[PDB]
Design a protein around this ligand. Structure first.
Ligand SMILES: [Ca+2]
Ligand SMILES: [Ca+2]
Ligand SMILES: [Cl-]
Ligand SMILES: [Cl-]
Ligand SMILES: [Cl-]
Ligand SMILES: [Cl-]
Ligand SMILES: [Cl-]
Ligand SMILES: [Cl-]
Ligand SMILES: [Cl-]
Ligand SMILES: [Cl-]
Length: 121
């Protein structure tokens, strides 16, 4: 919902165009990322992992944000909510930055096609 709103504001695409992209976007992730957008998702998964190790529940946290001409501003009552926002912001910025190589063929990519090693965080 929130991450999804952020993705839409930053990329011009519906949130559904990222939610099962490549090997990393959406739940889980293994093998080698298909492209730069998928690397965004690999880094996002790593970011959430760091937050879980800090005591946060980033898959559940809800935060506040705005998008102005100046960028994305994150907020929230708790530090865990602000951290979750920051992980999402990095990923949404990374998606935007890689719009040029986004490929519709990797949307809803069947994870059975994912091959190669799993890069470490
Ligand atoms: Ca993932
Ligand atoms: Ca996929
Ligand atoms: Cl960091
Ligand atoms: Cl979580
Ligand atoms: Cl920003
Ligand atoms: Cl911020
Ligand atoms: Cl709250
Ligand atoms: Cl906290
Ligand atoms: Cl395309
Ligand atoms: Cl598109």
């Amino acid at each position: 919902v929130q991450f999804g709103v952020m993705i839409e504001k930053m990329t011009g695409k519906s949130a559904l165009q990222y939610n099962d992209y490549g090997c990393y976007c959406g739940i889980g992730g293994s093998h080698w990322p298909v492209d730069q957008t998928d690397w965004c998702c690999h880094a996002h998964d790593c970011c959430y992992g760091r937050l879980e190790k800090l005591g946060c529940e980033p898959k559940l946290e809800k935060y506040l944000f705005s998008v102005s001409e100046r960028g994305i501003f994150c907020a929230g009552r708790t530090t865990c909510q602000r951290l979750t926002c920051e992980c999402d912001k990095r990923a949404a910025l990374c998606f935007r930055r890689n719009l040029g190589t986004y490929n519709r063929k990797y949307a809803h990519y069947p994870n059975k096609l994912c091959t190669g090693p799993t890069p470490p965080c």
